[PDB]
Nucleic acid binder design. Structure first.
Lengths: 53, 141, 191, 75, 137, 127
RNA sequence: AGCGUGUGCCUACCCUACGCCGGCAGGCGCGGGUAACCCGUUGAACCCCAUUCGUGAUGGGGAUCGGGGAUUGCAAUUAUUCCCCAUGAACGAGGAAUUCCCAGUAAGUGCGGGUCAUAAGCUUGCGUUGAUUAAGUCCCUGCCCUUUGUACACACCGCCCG
């Protein structure tokens, strides 16, 4: 109703976050994972990203 | 000689001249003004050069299944000096190459190929092979 | 090619390192003639191996110096091939022999080391190994040619020929020859 | 120093100097002509290609980058 | 071969004659290299030579083309002043006249008091650049 | 601004076009000429929307006496392009904290409002 | 040439060959591709080469500025960026200092990925071209090995006399 309350959110840092934690900073957007790097570090084992070299 | 037989510089040099004698190629009225590539420093010293490119292209197509202007722009495209920034590719003009492609058609050297890209014609294939021989024949040296 | 394995077109046979001791880190080809001053060349792993490397190529490598010129061997090979031709025009001979001679003549026999010496550090006259003599010579000549060529119209191939020829018979016109005499003169005092 | 200023057009007498000298030198390139005369470098060049006429001078390599010429073909 | 001139004047600038034409011309304000190169090609000259060489003829011919470039198959995009504004020109300003128009343009937006104008007036910068660390000396 | 000489006498042609002619078209036919950045902005702006503003301009143009300047019209639209419709008006042009007041001379044409309201402050090294 | 990359997506959107117009920048019409299928035999760039220039801050260099074209976005003014012209700077080899490095290594050289709507001088790999040079040692520096000295132990960046 309140026509008041939004301006474009389509693109840029402001258009996205961490599916894990809201953070709009340092975001992994490759392969559609969309996790912030800090989180991705903590969840890379359960996603299937494993250290080899 | 197959055109493949003759060295690229002499082949192109001989054919380009042959085209010049023939007198009928056709030429965006410009060609005086044009650089040939944004990358380019100055236009071509040989204002006569339109012929050389044409020869170069005809030879370029004969070699390969089919080619189009974008490829040529890049082929002609050299490195461009960003100035402060490091140098990068910049595919060379599209008007010249296109006009070259259109003009060649007029002579029938090349014809639209199937699935995009211009291909050499048998008429051209014959023509290039013929000059190729003349060049081979000239001399040893 | 099949008769004898010449250089670009120059014969390896009959070139003699006119200088005992040096004999042998100057590598012509007590069988090794090739064709081109370019090779895959793995010299680095061992300490010695470099000696195996043809002196010509060794000279060519030293040619490509200065940050911009690094890795331009094709350019050096081209320069070297031209230089040999200029040298040949200038005195007949084997320019390769001319090259070898310049190298033999330039290596500082004696040198100096900065011995600690207490205070007013004095410098100790020591004799110099043949590997060093070869290594140092090729530098000297290359640095000589490169230094001369830079503000002058003349090309490295030409300046190289001039440095090589003057050195082959030590004219002392050469930068390198003057440098070697300087290094040696220093060696003698100190002692 | 080395400030170089060059005569960039033919002066007759300098045309004579060219054909009556250059047979003297064993080595001639752009630079030689430039230093020993006071030729442009640009007008050095044109003098080289001309000299190779039917030559005063003889080609042994004109690598893109460099001509390298010898004395004419004497005794 | 032949000789003459050293030292020739075109329209109000002194042009070294020893120099190659294309390059020689580029002393003139407003004649950059891409300019002068295309002007000469238009003007029929043996490209192969020295400004000091050539004829009084060829010279007027260069100048005539230089100040009416459009009228010679020189495209407008090649030009210094497209879209004038004050007249909606196209133009290619030349010689003393470039300094002139430069002055005008700066004045224009100083009259109007636009921030760029102001910047030029204090003798800072007008493109968006940081002014904290550089252009200090 | 109507009759022989009276008021008139500042001239200014924009792009070969004259202000007499300028003041009489449609903003359409003006942006058509040459400006290119301003024209794209208004097209894309478009739909267009400083609508009310433009009516606020004409309004205060009316209520202004008969000789001079008058009261002004405020705005935050820095990205607006000056077009002949505007010229002669008075614009309060915000810069972040201040609204600078500026009459738009015909010269400005094709320029952006923001170019006449400086944000930053010169500065200081000594002082 | 090589590592790599893509749309049909947590909510708005892809990589793009090919025809045409335009000097360019770019515009415009198509058609394939969940890809080892297509873009892309990644026909890269250095480089190699036939010319010009000619040792002049010149054609080395591309700063700053002016005008102008276009692209992204609703919005670019405080230039996102790109181009075209013009204006054509310092810099002609770097003192005190000081980093890093042993073989595909140093160095030249382009490309792709991340950021991303747009935007690379960045980072982050990758192939290409490819040397000089120790082949060792503990001098300086740094850290741990004994032996030794220590009023130190928040440990020398520590705690002694008037």
């Amino acid at each position: 109703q309140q026509l008041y309350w939004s301006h474009p959110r389509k693109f840029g840092q402001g258009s996205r976050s961490c599916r894990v934690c809201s953070n709009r900073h340092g975001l992994i957007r490759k392969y559609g994972l969309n996790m912030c790097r800090q989180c991705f570090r903590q969840y890379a084992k359960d996603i299937g990203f494993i250290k080899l070299d | 000689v197959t055109v493949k037989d003759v060295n690229q510089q002499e082949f192109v040099r001989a054919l380009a001249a042959f085209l010049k004698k023939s007198g009928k190629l056709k030429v965006p009225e410009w060609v005086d003004t044009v650089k040939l590539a944004k990358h380019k420093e100055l236009a071509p010293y040989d204002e006569n050069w339109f012929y050389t490119r044409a020869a170069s292209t005809a030879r370029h197509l004969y070699l390969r299944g089919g080619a189009g202007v974008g490829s040529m722009t890049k082929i002609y495209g050299g490195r461009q000096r960003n100035g402060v920034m490091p140098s990068h590719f910049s595919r060379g003009s599209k008007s010249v190459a296109r006009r070259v492609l259109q003009a060649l058609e007029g002579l029938k050297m090349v014809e639209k190929d199937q699935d995009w890209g211009r291909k050499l014609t048998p008429q051209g294939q014959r023509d290039l092979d013929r000059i190729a021989g003349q060049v081979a024949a000239a001399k040893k040296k | 090619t099949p008769d004898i394995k010449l250089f670009g077109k120059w014969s390896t046979d009959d070139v003699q390192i006119n200088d005992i001791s040096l004999q042998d880190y100057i590598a012509v080809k007590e069988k090794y003639a090739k064709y081109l001053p370019h090779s895959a060349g793995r010299y680095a792993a061992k300490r010695f191996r470099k000696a195996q490397c043809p002196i010509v190529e060794r000279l060519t490598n030293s040619m490509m110096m200065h940050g911009r010129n690094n890795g331009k061997k094709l350019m050096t090979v081209r320069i070297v091939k031209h230089a040999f031709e200029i040298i040949h025009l200038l005195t007949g001979e084997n320019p390769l022999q001319v090259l070898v001679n310049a190298i033999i003549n330039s290596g500082p026999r004696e040198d100096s080391t900065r011995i600690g010496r207490a205070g007013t550090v004095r410098r100790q006259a020591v004799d110099v190994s043949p590997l060093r003599r070869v290594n140092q010579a090729i530098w000297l000549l290359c640095t000589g040619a490169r230094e001369a060529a830079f503000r002058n119209i003349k090309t490295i191939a030409e300046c190289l020929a001039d440095e090589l020829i003057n050195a082959a018979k030590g004219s002392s016109n050469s930068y390198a020859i003057k440098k070697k005499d300087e290094l040696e003169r220093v060696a003698k005092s100190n002692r | 120093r080395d400030k170089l200023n060059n005569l960039v057009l033919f002066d007759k007498a300098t045309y004579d100097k060219l054909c009556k000298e250059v047979p003297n030198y064993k080595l001639i390139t752009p630079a030689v002509v430039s230093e020993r005369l006071k030729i442009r470098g640009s007008l050095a060049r044109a003098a080289l290609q001309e000299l190779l006429s039917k030559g005063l001078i003889k080609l042994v390599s004109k690598h893109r980058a460099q001509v390298i010429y010898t004395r004419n073909t004497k005794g | 071969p032949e000789k003459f001139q050293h030292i020739l004047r075109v329209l109000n600038t002194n042009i070294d004659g020893r120099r190659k034409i294309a390059f020689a011309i580029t002393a003139i304000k407003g004649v950059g290299r891409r300019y002068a190169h295309v002007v000469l090609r238009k003007a029929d000259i043996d490209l192969t030579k020295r400004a000091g060489e050539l004829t009084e003829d060829e010279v007027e011919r260069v100048i005539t083309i230089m100040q009416n470039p459009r009228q010679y198959k020189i495209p407008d995009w090649f030009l210094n002043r497209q879209k004038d504004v004050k007249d909606g020109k196209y133009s290619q300003v030349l010689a003393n006249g470039l300094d002139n128009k430069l002055r005008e343009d700066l004045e224009r937006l100083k009259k109007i008091r636009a921030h760029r104008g102001l910047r030029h007036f204090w003798g800072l910068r007008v493109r968006g650049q940081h002014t904290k660390t550089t252009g200090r000396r | 601004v109507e009759q022989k000489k009276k008021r008139t006498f500042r001239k200014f042609t924009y792009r070969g076009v004259d202000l007499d002619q300028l003041l009489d078209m449609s903003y359409e036919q003006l942006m058509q000429l040459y400006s290119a950045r301003q024209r794209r902005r208004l097209s894309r702006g478009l739909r267009r929307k400083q609508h009310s503003l433009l009516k606020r301009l004409r309004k205060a143009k009316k209520e202004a006496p008969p000789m001079e300047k008058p009261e002004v019209v405020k705005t935050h639209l820095r990205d607006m392009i000056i077009l002949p419709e505007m010229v002669g008006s008075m614009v309060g042009v915000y810069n972040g904290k201040t609204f600078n007041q500026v009459e738009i001379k015909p010269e400005m044409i094709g320029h952006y409002l923001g170019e006449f309201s400086i944000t930053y402050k010169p500065v200081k090294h000594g002082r």
